[PDB]
Ligand binder design. Structure first.
Ligand SMILES: [Zn+2]
Ligand SMILES: [Zn+2]
Ligand SMILES: [Zn+2]
Ligand SMILES: [Zn+2]
Ligand SMILES: [Zn+2]
Ligand SMILES: [Zn+2]
Lengths: 95, 95
């Protein structure tokens, strides 16, 4: 319906960012904490936390506390498939 | 690589629009011409053509001339899967 399409608009508007894409891509390889994400991608923890908060609000990523810190990961299989299909579509030959 | 992620950013930034999503969704059901798309969605042909041009430049949609008018469709299976997985993710229950 109408409301459903608005929600998907939300989802895509959240992926339309270079650094959020780098965060998603990294998460598609392995779940991780803010420090790890911040270290590997060279983004500050505060910026990383700010982006994850947005990504989480549209259900693109989820978080679970394990030990001391929160461990982030792609919400579910739909998100992973969606992302991986897009990455691949961007790389294969297109004449 | 770096350039690949910029390209996927492009793709998602193009889907982050309510009307472009309505055009993609309609195309995911059936290929169609500008007039059909414009009629069904109540968007003018000029606006529809403008959006398709953008969608085409990032390889989200493709066009083929059949008869007199151009027939548009999702570029390939990756685009269709990507879109359908997202639509579904937006609708299923998420607690
Ligand atoms: Zn930063
Ligand atoms: Zn499902
Ligand atoms: Zn493809
Ligand atoms: Zn219009
Ligand atoms: Zn393929
Ligand atoms: Zn889902």
């Amino acid at each position: 319906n109408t409301d459903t399409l608005e929600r998907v608009t939300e989802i895509f508007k959240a992926l339309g960012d270079y650094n959020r894409i780098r965060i998603m891509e990294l998460l598609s390889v392995s779940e991780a904490s803010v420090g790890h994400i911040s270290h590997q991608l060279n983004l500050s923890q505060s910026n990383v936390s700010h982006q994850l908060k947005l990504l989480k609000s549209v259900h693109l990523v989820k978080a679970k506390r394990q030990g001391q810190s929160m461990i982030y990961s792609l919400d579910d299989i739909h998100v992973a498939t969606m992302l991986k299909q897009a990455i691949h579509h961007a790389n294969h030959p297109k004449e």
